[PDB]
Structures are given as structure tokens and as C-alpha cells.
Symmetry: C6
Amino acid sequence: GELKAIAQELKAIAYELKAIAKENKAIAQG
Amino acid sequence: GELKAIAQELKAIAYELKAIAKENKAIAQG
Amino acid sequence: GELKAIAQELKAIAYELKAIAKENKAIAQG
Amino acid sequence: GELKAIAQELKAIAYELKAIAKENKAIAQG
Amino acid sequence: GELKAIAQELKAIAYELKAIAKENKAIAQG
Amino acid sequence: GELKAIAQELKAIAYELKAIAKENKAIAQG
């Protein structure tokens, strides 16, 4: 149901934030 | 209902974060 | 209802992320 | 109630994102 | 309860976003 | 329960934001 769908989307959000963290570290280092 | 609305907005949020990840990747590439 | 209120704030969050993506792209293209 | 508390925290999150959008716009300008 | 746990995590999230807004403001002002 | 799952994903989100805050501070001061 929709509570699972909500959890799944939060999982996708975490994945994108992890990607942003990675790029911003690269920006800090460069 | 409203739980689906919440799921759909989280989907939109993930989508915008994907876009930020992309632009930051470009910024990190100089 | 508060569930609708939650959905509405998530829509606002998506909107602000969209704006952030827009500015970061401009930084990128700049 | 806790659902209202969640809505309120989301409102605080939207406010901080709006602040970030404003600063990134400033960065883009400069 | 878990609804309280959710509110508490959102509070932590708002806190981190406030930290990011602070740093981006500093970047903007330079 | 899915409510616990949601709380746990929000915890992971707070973790990633903490990392972004750290990197943006380095960008600011670096």
C-alpha cells in the first residue's frame, strides 16, 4: 500500500542526497 | 486519497534532487 | 485535514528544490 | 497532535529550502 | 510512538538544512 | 511496520544532509 510507497520514495530521496554529498565533496576538494 | 498524494509529492522531490545532483556534478567538473 | 496539510508542504518543498536546481544549473552554465 | 507536528516541521523545512534557493541565486549572480 | 519519531527526524532534517543555508549564505557573501 | 521504515529512511536522509552541510562548510572556508 501507500505507506510502503512512501518509504520507497524516501529511499530514493536518500539515494539522491548521497549523490549530492558526493559531488559537493568533489567541489570542496577541487 | 491523501496517502497517495504524499507519495506522489515525495516522487517529485526525488525528481528535483536528481536534477540538483546533475547540476552539482557539472559544477564539480569545473 | 493534516494529511492534506502534509501533502501541501511537500508540494512546497518540491517547488523550492526546483528553484535550487534552477540556480545551480545557472552556476553550472556560468 | 503528531500529524500537525509533522506538518509544522515540513513547513520549517520549506523555509530553509527557500533560504537556500535565495543564497544560490545570489551565488549564481556573483 | 513512530509518528513522534518521524517528527523528531524531520526536526533533525530542518536543523541540517539550516546549517546548509548558513554556509551557502557565507559563500554568497564572498 | 512501515511507520518505522519511514522513520529509518528519514534518519538516513538526515545523515546525508549532515554530510552536505559539512562539505558546504569546507567550500565556504576553503
